[PDB]
Structures are given as C-alpha cells and as structure tokens.
Design a protein around this ligand. Structure first.
Ligand SMILES: [Fe+2]
Length: 185
C-alpha cells in the first residue's frame, strides 16, 4: 500500500482517490491506515473540550468529502448514530476508541441490539456505512485522551442519534468546534 509520509501527503492522495465517481473503500482504508500518525503534524487541530468530544474540520476535499479530527477527552463518547448514507472512515491518531455496532431499529420500540464490538488499535482505520449498521464510538480510557481522523463522502451536515433503550431517533445538526485550526463562533 502507498504510504503517506505526512498528513499533507495523505490529503493529497485522498483528493485523487475521491476525484472520480467510484470509490474503492478497501483501497482508501488501506491508505489511511498506512499513514503513521504524527502529533506534530496534527496538533493544531487537536482542540479539546472539557465535557464532550470535538469536531475539527481539516479539509473540505473539493466538495468531495470532509476530513476532520475528533478529540475525545477522558471518557468521552458519542451517541449511537447513522451516517446519512455516506461512506465513513475513522482512523486512530492517538489513544483508543471502542466501537460498538448496532442493528437498525424497527417501527416497534425496544432495546437496541449490539451486532459487534471492538477496539480500534494504533493507526487502525475502520469503515462504516448505513448498510453496515449504526454505531457508537468511545474513548476507552478515563485518564488518557483519544484522537481520530474522520472522512465522509459525500459530506453531510446532519445525522440521527438513537436512544439505546427504545431505538427512538432524532435529527442532529453536526457542528464544528474549529475549522482549519481556527476556533469557530
Ligand atoms: Fe460514526
């Protein structure tokens, strides 16, 4: 696999990968994973919040995708969510995330079913889409932070958040804590 030597190279390569109409998921996953995380290259995007994780936009991929960095503070986690019909890749940059895959709820109301559960390792890149399942992702440590790099294509502004007890969902607008290293409003 082609190995980006720096986040810049990776981004460059991504522009090519998503330039077309076809996307080789396997191939992208490989290239994201090959990139060996280097805090020096991404610290400018590593802006944490005390209470919840943060989204820091990194690149807009010429409209073809969103490359962002999420910063999980001690014990921070996400909700069980979908991915608005887009491709979604997440690669570990620091620390470890526990990913739990869930099955889509029905009209009926009741406890959501876990389909898979694992821990993403160092520099590991995972992949997901709506036809695969819903998921929840969490920092496994209560003393160290976690940092992941995320790519969505096409990009999307909203997602659904699921209630693990009933499967009830609600629309959520996704916001950014910072863009291009710049804290937002
Ligand atoms: Fe997700």
């Amino acid at each position: 696999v082609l190995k980006p030597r720096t986040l810049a190279d990776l981004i460059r390569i991504l522009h090519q990968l998503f330039a077309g109409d076809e996307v080789n998921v396997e191939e992208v996953q490989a290239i994201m994973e090959a990139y060996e995380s280097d805090p020096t290259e991404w610290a400018m995007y590593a802006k944490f919040d005390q209470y919840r994780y943060t989204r820091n936009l990194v690149d807009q991929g010429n409209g073809k995708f969103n490359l962002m960095i999420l910063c999980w503070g001690e014990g921070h986690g996400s909700s069980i969510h979908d991915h608005t019909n887009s491709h979604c890749f997440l690669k570990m940059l620091q620390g470890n995330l526990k990913e739990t895959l869930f099955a889509w709820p029905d009209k009926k109301s009741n406890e959501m079913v876990k389909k898979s559960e694992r821990v993403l390792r160092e520099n590991q890149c995972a992949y997901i889409n709506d036809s695969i399942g819903l998921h929840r992702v969490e920092n496994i440590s209560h003393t160290e932070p976690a940092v992941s790099l995320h790519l969505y294509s096409p990009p999307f502004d909203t997602c659904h958040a699921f209630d693990q007890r009933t499967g009830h969902k609600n629309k959520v607008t996704m916001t950014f804590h910072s863009k291009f290293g710049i804290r937002t409003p």
